[PDB]
């Protein structure tokens, strides 16, 4: 089971719900994201969408910054038939299951 905290240090669960991400340098070199993350704006998170929010913030903080995950997602895009990237994500969901 995953145990997780928001990665920015003094701003874990904000009052307004606008969880400002700290910027990471993504391509191992040369870029930057500076994202945010708004909390519940179209309802609430009903005890299962906390687990999806538990994994979106992990794939956005500790995964795009890594150099072996961006190289693992590079090699899927250079595969066979992975064109028009609504099929790139459907060729990645078959590897994760």
């Amino acid at each position: 089971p995953l145990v997780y905290t928001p990665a920015v240090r003094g701003g874990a669960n904000p009052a307004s719900g606008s969880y400002l991400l700290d910027p990471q340098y993504v391509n191992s070199g040369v870029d930057i994201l500076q994202a945010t993350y708004g909390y519940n704006i179209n309802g609430t998170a009903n005890a299962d969408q906390l687990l999806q929010r538990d994994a979106i913030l992990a794939i956005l903080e500790y995964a795009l910054k890594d150099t072996a995950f961006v190289n693992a997602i590079q090699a899927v895009a250079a595969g066979s038939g992975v064109t028009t990237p609504a099929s790139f994500v459907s060729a990645c969901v078959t590897k994760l299951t």
Partner: protein
């Protein structure tokens, strides 16, 4: 639904801090001269008498 959640603007403050070392210490005291000539010729006096 939060009212002004996704419409918040962020504003960087007026606090640029330069955090490198650029300094011409030795160039700042060499008593600079201009010279519009091709090369610098002078005389060096050795011995010999």
């Amino acid at each position: 639904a939060k009212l002004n959640l996704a419409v918040l603007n962020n504003v960087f403050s007026e606090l640029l801090t330069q955090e490198i070392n650029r300094s011409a210490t030795f160039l700042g005291l060499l008593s600079k001269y201009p010279e519009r000539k091709s090369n610098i010729q002078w005389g060096v006096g050795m011995g010999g008498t």
